[PDB]
Amino acid sequence: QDWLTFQKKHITNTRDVDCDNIMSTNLFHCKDKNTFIYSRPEPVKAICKGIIASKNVLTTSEFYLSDCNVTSRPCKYKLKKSTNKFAVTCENQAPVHFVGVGSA
């Protein structure tokens, strides 16, 4: 989509996110699982340096990222708080898509 709205979708202001509450917003619209990126926008975009075409890149740094995984309970979750690097799809040297946490 775009660099700015990607922030609205995955860039949050809190490491301790009430994702359990947030999910009632159509943004998450009672999702099963979503990771967030608690970061400044600039550090995030820096991963995409050199990336013109749309392709995913792995973060060189570790970021404060949490995964809301829905339990057996309907739209109720567990929070998994992690600090790791992530993969994002960059285009025009801007992250627009989140691929997921998973790396060495």
UniProtKB/Swiss-Prot annotation:
Q: What is its EC number?
A: 3.1.27.-
Q: What class of enzyme is it?
A: hydrolase
Query: What are the transmembrane regions?
Result: none
- What are the binding positions for substrate in this chain? 31-35
Query: Which GO molecular function annotations are given, in alphabetical order?
Result: endonuclease activity; nucleic acid binding; RNA nuclease activity
Q: What does this protein do?
A: Basic protein with antiproliferative/cytotoxic activity against several tumor cell lines in vitro, as well as antitumor in vivo. It exhibits a ribonuclease-like activity against high molecular weight ribosomal RNA.
Indicate what this protein is called per its UniProt record.
Protein P-30
Q: Which organism is it from?
A: Lithobates pipiens (Northern leopard frog)
